Design a protein around this ligand. Structure first.
Ligand SMILES: CO[C@@H]1O[C@@H](C)[C@@H](O)[C@@H](O)[C@@H]1O
Ligand SMILES: CO[C@@H]1O[C@@H](C)[C@@H](O)[C@@H](O)[C@@H]1O
Ligand SMILES: CO[C@@H]1O[C@@H](C)[C@@H](O)[C@@H](O)[C@@H]1O
Ligand SMILES: CO[C@@H]1O[C@@H](C)[C@@H](O)[C@@H](O)[C@@H]1O
Ligand SMILES: CO[C@@H]1O[C@@H](C)[C@@H](O)[C@@H](O)[C@@H]1O
Ligand SMILES: CO[C@@H]1O[C@@H](C)[C@@H](O)[C@@H](O)[C@@H]1O
Lengths: 90, 88, 88
């Protein structure tokens, strides 16, 4: 009955990204200091986790989206979302 | 099962673990010298958290969800306040 | 139903650890720059969260595994996983 979220942040402003799994879809809300807005990330999933790291000022985000026993990694490296190499044998 | 979320900062470290249990989220805290129950108390069934340092000051954001509504709670050095977060 | 995951990362390679809870078993997949591999972590739980911090170049990881209302902390401090003092 309740949605499931994952959050990450970086720098001191900060920037924040909050991912929500709702009815099989994961969407993203974003803060960069002046208001929340809807982000580009939109992929299937019933469960989400996230981690991120900086290289200098460049953010790198990895979102782990799961449906059933299948987890797909999605990558942001400054220039759009792409599927990552992660696999598991769940 | 209960649902948890964890964050940490520095090198001591400090850790905060948030647990959703039967619609209530509570907080356990480590600052190097034993666990204790923190001030955070808010309703929710699922929880996530992030935190960042500004120099030596910690800032924490906890995202508490009930049904389709997620409420953000903010620690900025003196109590927890409702944040600007909204979602559709 | 779906598996439930938690993730942490460190440094600039980076290293990543992803924990998956699946029918009461939590396992770990690891990235250190050249491929994913299955890590040493194997503990029971229906829910998992994680946090980590560097002390110099040394990674320290805390995984919070829950079954019912009992959360167990598992600690990586450089040479295997040990149970932690976290209580709630
Ligand atoms: C600039 O794009 C915004 O920030 C990136 C870091 C991602 O979170 C993306 O989905 C979002 O729309
Ligand atoms: C370069 O490879 C990409 O980034 C790494 C840090 C990992 O997240 C990997 O699975 C992904 O495909
Ligand atoms: C000093 O207060 C303790 O630490 C803060 C950073 C918060 O986690 C608060 O809820 C907790 O009671
Ligand atoms: C200053 O605004 C507060 O802190 C920001 C970093 C965000 O968490 C925002 O939603 C919150 O209301
Ligand atoms: C070197 O060992 C690998 O990395 C450690 C940091 C842990 O994640 C461990 O479970 C994993 O097998
Ligand atoms: C040294 O103590 C160990 O590490 C601390 C950072 C905590 O995670 C504690 O519960 C654990 O037993």
């Amino acid at each position: 009955s309740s949605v499931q979220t994952a959050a990450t942040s970086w720098g001191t402003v900060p920037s924040i990204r909050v991912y929500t799994a709702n009815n099989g879809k994961i969407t993203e809300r974003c803060w960069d200091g002046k208001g929340w807005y809807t982000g580009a990330f939109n992929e299937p999933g019933d469960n989400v986790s996230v981690t991120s790291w900086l290289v200098g000022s460049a953010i790198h985000i990895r979102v782990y989206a799961s449906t059933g026993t299948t987890t797909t990694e999605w990558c942001w490296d400054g220039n759009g979302w792409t599927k990552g190499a992660y696999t598991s044998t769940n």
